[model samples]
Target: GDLINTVRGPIPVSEAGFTLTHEHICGSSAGFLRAWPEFFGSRKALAEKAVRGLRHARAAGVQTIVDVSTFDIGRDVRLLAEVSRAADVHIVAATGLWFDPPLSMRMRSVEELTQFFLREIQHGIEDTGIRAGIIKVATTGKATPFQELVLKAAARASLATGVPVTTHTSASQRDGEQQAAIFESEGLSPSRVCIGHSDDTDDLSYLTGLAARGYLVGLDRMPYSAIGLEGDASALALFGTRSWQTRALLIKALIDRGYKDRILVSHDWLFGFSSYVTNIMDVMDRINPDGMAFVPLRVIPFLREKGVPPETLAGVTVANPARFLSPT
Candidate 1:
């Protein structure tokens, strides 16, 4: 009975091979792609770009990707389904909110919010008939009141639907612990959660503690040095703190500690974005030359050289995600 929901529809969990547990097919301000298509480029162009990126990953042996772009960040299910079909890869889309909650979302009660996420999971996202496979929630360093509410709603939704939850955490501040605590309080099992972006810091205690508690530790942001800020020094200081080598070491340390089954690795790469401040795609391509294939093509080889067993590495990229996404 084990199954996973993907953009193209349900598939046996066993088929979810070599999965990247966190990634964005495309990111843009909510509604901007439709409101101002000129700035974001045509939908056709966006899909073609995403298709090419997914094909690159497929060539490197990636078979499934979890697209964690929530509605707040402009998740297009039709677009996701199209790309998944075109690329001949599985794309599991998400339901829930990102870091910033709009005023309307803030006004809803926790029960109402729970129903909102439930609608996406149980019904479909806005009549697309595309159900989300995961619940995604985020907090930057600390949770605001609204963020706390969203977390509660996400926890409730996950419990009700038997779907897993993934989170965007400020790893430098060890925010996953708080996220885990809230889920725990809601009686959700730790095994059902993946604390994402755990590689943003070198804190072994934080990563190991989560794994020790049975939460999946997402060493998901590989090739971190390629992520750059064009004009803001403060922003750069916050994000540009780790090299990809540091991330690889973090993975190795977790494996040594016997947490390989609790680990997941991904690029968190964005295929397309609508931003006026910088051409994010151009800048990312310039620095992260390997693109979406970095993990399979680059990091895996590097880990093998570092003496991490091939099977252990395979579990992190393949088995772990399948287990995480399988309905409990």
Candidate 2:
């Protein structure tokens, strides 16, 4: 077993048990600023209150969660380590840049940016012991020279750190393929990359094609966002009937592509970061109104009913990430 250890200290693979491939125990303060301009100036900065519910997420069967809250919007290093201890999940944070218009997007050189990234990954998370598990990079809706530079920097940074890379692709699919091309041109392996938010594409062929090229395609929004989360009964009907079909189709496509080893699934949940009038480590449940009520416990039953074998679920939720984020 390829167990993951945080720079904070040792993490049992058992503790890193049920992985939510993309989620935030702590949201980026920056994204919070988007929702509320005075977020930073609030009585309670959003990031402080993330610790309580982050611990709750651990109890919800999410033993490991990748906090993809990059950029200055709201990511914090030491605070994340504190939450890992408070919450008890093997919280693996991502060290990378996000969406254009942030300071990160304006960085000058791929090599120069990569050098900064190397210091954090190599020496451990700055200001604390909690090291990140993987490196993340994101792209915008359109392809441009600046976007190319950002992607190349991420690829180079991943290479320098020996960690796998994951990416954020905008609404445009061609942009994703173009990003992959840049990774290839830079000699980064496809198996180390993930093209995220692929759930919204609605094209099986394109999803399979991305998988066929050795990349992990993430399709993990939620019932309301995709199928519609009304309430309990509606959620039951959605998960029992439609949601699994969509998931199974994507899984089947990966099977077609012969890249089952490279697929990851999750709800990219933004919980407990902010609620405007007040911020809390243990936040209001209704923040993401459509977020899963019972995540692993509720959905696993439907997945089983949909004919997902136990072994396959175990692999997708566990072994896959461990292997992908290997030190190799």
Candidate 3:
């Protein structure tokens, strides 16, 4: 009875183990703004390619994947169900809004905003019986009154749905702060919130503070720095010092916050969307990493080096998310 969602029905949640907190399992997004020529929409042609990728990830010992782009944006739960059946990994769909700049200008006000999002969360993929395990929000537009209003609205929706929330903050730490403040203001425990892409700022103090408030800081897109882009490598570099020292530092800081349950790790690699050869072919990539594994294949080793207790590691990577989502 996860969430007892009126639209999507019920869904089983997972915890304990290697869980990719945020990703896309064959969904569509706006066409790139020309500058990003590599950016393509996630239609059938692209989905097929993701299927192969998911198979590869499955071979890599990965267990579950949460597809966070599952609504007004790039949501394709039908494809997700198809891919999940093929990959044999638990595939969770997402429902919510994008970060500010990307959010439709039409949603400029919070007047009907919370109710609007609640509709999406409760309706779940047009009532296909695939309820989202978690709810999401995106912070953008310089954190103005509009952004604050949206956050408050999203909070109200989360409260109504009993679904955990995740937010997309900017490359700066200020955005995450504003998001956290709004959630705290709503009296919704930060533990239920996931502040995504936190490593974009690399401010240890800020991230620690977020964790202290009981929020889950997801370190997805960790390879932005290593990959030499502002995406995955930033997270990888921000979370590591030459890959080892900083890795421990990040894990240590999260643990130091006395909230080890407040961290998530993933690659946000976005399999098959940019150039999957063909749309339908892209679905294969969604099931596996095409040998890339989205998340760092090296995490297990780093955790061992950081002396992360096995149980705690499992809790953060698996159990915590599972429990947070269990209610939904």
Candidate 4:
């Protein structure tokens, strides 16, 4: 089937237009919404906020969003379905683990964890009957012993199911290289993976190297900001963050090098989060006012101004994502 699984159901790859490859509708500690709904506002309120955000993106011509929130990050499929229906946009959910492995997961072997992800990708998530469209695996700076297990499991599941894999990498540390190595060791092709958050670093050689190896480079963190509550001044200095203009230049450089087909761009925005004392959305809104529409409305025009042809930008936002999500 040449279809992409979404919250509502599978849709043909041709319909996945102007896609945002990495984003989150809701994010929090796992089970927090169930434990205390009011802590993040009631489900109804949260759903409305998500709908409004998606609607804004829809108005700007975004047709689909990949929500990379996994089980540990409070992925709510039912809510996602409702928002997708109301906003009239496709929402593709994820299966796999996030940065931290729970103690119980630590005890599980790689085969056991592979089955866990396989169940979701094949059967559907927690009986919601909404199958995940992608497998998400994460590493910070480098993979821990346990994180490596999760990465291997994600690779095995992706190979078994024929779905693609996307990674949350600490790009400043050049973690995507290690991630690609792990997946390759498991017999997964580099083309089946998208090395996400590649924009977190200003290193063109690093991005180009991954593209040269046939992996899709995710320049997904548009409208970069380093002055939020999550800000670490020392880490920011160490990582060498680039301005949004510089990030656009990186995209231009990639396109110029004949790797346009291997590039994808997005905002990596999250609409609502409850992992802090305040609603992180409020803080995030201050930093990323455009939210999901940043790439389409702002970044594309800037790139056009810099003489990147509209057809090239379209390939990055539309064609690349459709091909990446479609199973080979």
- Candidate 3 to truth, TM: 0.77
Displacement of the residue 137 alpha carbon in candidate 4, Å: 0.4
The residue-by-residue lDDT of candidate 2 on 1-328, one tens digit each, is 5555563565655556677777764444555555663544542444444555565555666777777766543566565676667666666777776663355447567777677566657666656755666777777666566667778877888877677777777623545688788999999988888787676556767777777788878755533232343454533332333454465466545644466677787766665444223443222244243343235655556666767778877888777777666655
lDDT of 4 by residue, 1-328 (tens): 5998999998999999999999998877677778888876788888888888899999998999999889988898998899999999999999999875577777889999999999888999997989999999999888998889888999899889888899989888999999999999999988889999898887889989999999999988886665433365543442235667777777888999999999989887877777544644665687667788888888899989989999999999999999999977
Instruction: Report the Cα RMSD per candidate.
Output: 1.8, 5.5, 5.6, 2.3
lDDT of 1 by residue, 113-209 (tens): 9999999999999888889999999999888888888989999999999899999998889999899989898999999999999999889998899
Candidate 3 local lDDT, 1-328, one digit each (tens)? 2332211234444322366777775334533322342444434444555667677777766777777774434566666777667666667667666642355634557757776666666655565756666676776536666667777877787788777888777746457887877888897877778898775655878888777767788776554433222344433333332332343357656776576877887666565443223442233333232433634456655676677787877777777667666543
lDDT order, best first, reads: 1, 4, 2, 3
- TM-score (C-alpha, index-matched) for candidate 4: 0.94
lDDT of each: 0.86, 0.63, 0.62, 0.86
* Clashes within 3 Å, all models in order: 0, 14, 60, 0
Q: How does candidate 1 fare on TM-score? A: 0.96
lDDT of 1 at 229: 59
Tell how far residue 7 is off in model 3, in angstroms.
Answer: 12
Model 1 Cα shift for residue 238 (angstroms): 6.3
Scanning candidate 4 in windows of ten residues, the lowest lDDT window is: 232-241
